[PDB]
Write a protein that binds this ligand. Structure first.
Ligand SMILES: CS(=O)(=O)N1CCC[C@H](NC(=O)[C@H](CCC2CCCCC2)NC(=O)c2ccc(CNC(=O)c3cnc4ccccn34)cc2)C1
Length: 273
């Protein structure tokens, strides 16, 4: 166990507490997710599996499990703390340089880190399943950590399609094969990365396919399957030159084997820096 006596409460954020730690080897800031002790057994099991999965994940662009406190109650997991909250709210508060304000190159450096992060996970055959800027965190100097906050935050309910007794689905980010089968792969993670790169280039000014209903997005997935010319695509954002747009379009290839691997996507977005 990490020692509880080394976590000095700073701020609230089942609760997430901003904390600082002296001489962990400025004091180190860490984020501490605390499971309520009235927590159900299902919730406790989920928290122990979230600990198990995070434990194996060690990359500059993925949230990092720093320590746990589980031998006693309440159950604690400790991650690194990202100062600027999730990437969706962060970019929504920004505008493209001609404020605050973010240059085009910085948008690519943001996009490349998410790609470097997905690339790491692909070397483990780890499929994210719900990649989107709302699951990315921003630290200092626009460093990006992929995370997964799950599917039940009110702020983002609209990004999820729910049917009673079914898995809740982030359909507007999902590959056509996913929408039709529940079959998630690294290749489908690539598709969702294409939609994440679209969001970043939109500086998050709109939801994908936002003028179309849930049902129309599902219908669109069927048209990729039918492949008689009726499938439609996310448009090119204002900030996006046509070359970068053509990278996004490759992410939405019908055949998952024609979609770019993350190694290549990272290589191409990291080039400008
Ligand atoms: C297995 S599942 O698909 O069924 N399931 C569904 C429900 C969601 C589950 N997620 C998870 O397992 C991941 C496991 C890692 C994930 C990594 C990416 C690749 C896939 C795996 N848990 C988290 O992402 C996580 C995130 C933050 C924190 C605490 N730190 C903070 O909040 C924090 C830190 N800085 C700030 C700044 C502002 C506010 C808060 N913070 C704790 C956990 C997955």
């Amino acid at each position: 166990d990490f020692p509880r006596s080394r976590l000095r409460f700073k701020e609230k954020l089942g609760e997430v507490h901003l904390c600082e730690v002296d001489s962990p080897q400025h004091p180190l800031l860490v984020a501490v997710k605390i499971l309520r002790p009235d927590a159900t057994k299902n919730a406790r099991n989920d928290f122990l599996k979230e600990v198990k999965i995070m434990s194996r994940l060690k990359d500059p662009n993925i949230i990092r499990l720093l320590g746990v406190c589980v031998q006693d109650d309440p159950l604690c997991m400790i991650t690194d703390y990202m100062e600027n909250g999730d990437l969706n709210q962060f970019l929504s508060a920004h505008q493209l340089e001609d404020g605050p304000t973010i240059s085009y190159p910085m948008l690519l450096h943001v996009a490349a880190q998410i790609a470097s992060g997905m690339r790491y996970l692909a070397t483990l055959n780890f499929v994210h399943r719900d990649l989107a800027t709302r699951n990315c965190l921003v630290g200092e100097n626009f460093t990006i950590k992929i995370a997964d906050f799950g599917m039940s935050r009110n702020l983002y309910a609209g990004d999820y399609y729910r049917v009673q007794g079914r898995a809740v689905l982030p359909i507007r980010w999902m590959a056509w094969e996913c929408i039709l089968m529940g079959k998630f792969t690294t290749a489908s993670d690539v598709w969702a990365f294409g939609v994440t790169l679209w969001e970043v280039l939109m500086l998050c000014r709109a939801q994908p396919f936002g003028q179309l209903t849930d049902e129309q997005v599902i219908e669109n997935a069927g048209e990729f399957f039918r492949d008689q010319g009726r499938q439609v695509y996310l448009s090119r954002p204002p900030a996006c030159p046509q070359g970068l747009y053509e990278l996004m379009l490759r992410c939405w290839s019908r055949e998952s084997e024609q979609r770019p691997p993350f190694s290549q996507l990272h290589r191409f977005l990291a080039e400008d820096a």
